């Protein structure tokens, strides 16, 4: 059996957490639930915003979010009023006044979340996944990768077959902690299953 998330396993390399907030243990379940309340709404509303990562931060009676997108022009607009709307509604579920920081992605087709979008959206469009995946792999090795694996799972092309398919390029370490692999997992669902995808990107050792 396969085990442990290929990036979540590396948090032990003294990495920071996806939200930083302080509260005494008797209110910890609700202070954590407030964190899910914002992360689940922001990810649901950024599902088609070309976003690669989201980080939350919750200072004392405050919330400060940092989101990375390849296309900030579909998150900001109207002299900043179209994001002033997003600021209004996140404060409505956070219960605190908000700040919203939008970072712009360069080389987005080298980032595991946006490389995964490039195949997940085309798998929903019933595109020939072996071609679409081969291009996504070679394009990553063109743009800045040193090794990559993209791996598809279940109902391959709607057929009565499970297994996995990938075709790996370059080098991708498995158990070397200086390797810093960029990772993502997605689902395309359609009407006949879940139709999953996984991706591992290697850029060089730390």
């Amino acid at each position: 059996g396969q085990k442990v998330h290929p990036n979540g396993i590396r948090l032990g390399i003294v990495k920071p957490w996806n939200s930083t907030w302080f509260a005494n243990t008797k209110e910890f379940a609700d202070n954590l639930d407030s964190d899910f309340k914002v992360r689940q709404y922001l990810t649901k509303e950024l599902a088609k915003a070309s976003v690669s990562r989201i980080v939350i931060e919750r200072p004392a009676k405050s919330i400060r979010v940092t989101i990375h997108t390849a296309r900030p022009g579909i998150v900001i607009g109207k002299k900043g009023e179209d994001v002033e709307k997003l600021r209004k509604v996140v404060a409505d579920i956070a219960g605190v006044p908000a700040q919203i920081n939008i970072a712009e992605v360069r080389k987005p087709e080298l980032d595991a979340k946006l490389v995964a979008d490039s195949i997940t959206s085309q798998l929903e469009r019933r595109v020939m996944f072996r071609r679409a995946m081969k291009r996504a792999v070679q394009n990553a090795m063109r743009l800045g990768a040193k090794g990559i694996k993209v791996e598809v799972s279940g109902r391959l092309g709607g057929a009565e077959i499970a297994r996995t398919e990938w075709y790996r390029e370059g080098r991708v370490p498995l158990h070397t902690l200086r390797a810093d692999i960029d990772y993502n997992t997605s689902e395309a669902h359609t009407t006949y299953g879940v139709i999953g995808v996984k991706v591992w990107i290697f850029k060089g050792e730390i």
Binding site: N7, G8, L11, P16, W17, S19, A29, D35
Partner: protein
């Protein structure tokens, strides 16, 4: 987990804003032992034996993402079967896999 269960759990948070003012004091009044074979609540006892979700029993924290009845841990504020997802997503501050 049942939709009629969370309905009761949500109404229990609004109960905390209407019951602990005076009805929790009426529950103390009808639980008193000091008087014997004399009436003082004869018409209002059925007006206090009806409320029941105000009992300390029959409560569990439950999972706020799966409604799971058991598996809670006060140190995490999270149901045990959802910790391994959160700890890989980085969603709990200070938590790390180490061994020692």
């Amino acid at each position: 987990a049942k939709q009629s269960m969370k309905a009761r759990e949500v109404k229990r948070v609004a109960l905390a804003d209407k019951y602990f003012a005076k009805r929790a004091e009426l529950k103390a009044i009808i639980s008193d032992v000091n008087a014997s074979d004399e009436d003082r609540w004869n018409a209002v006892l059925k007006l206090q034996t009806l409320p029941r979700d105000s009992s300390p029993s029959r409560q569990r924290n439950r999972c706020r993402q799966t409604g799971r009845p058991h598996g809670f841990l006060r140190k995490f504020g999270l149901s045990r079967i959802k910790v391994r997802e959160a700890a890989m997503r980085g969603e709990i501050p200070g938590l790390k896999k180490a061994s020692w």
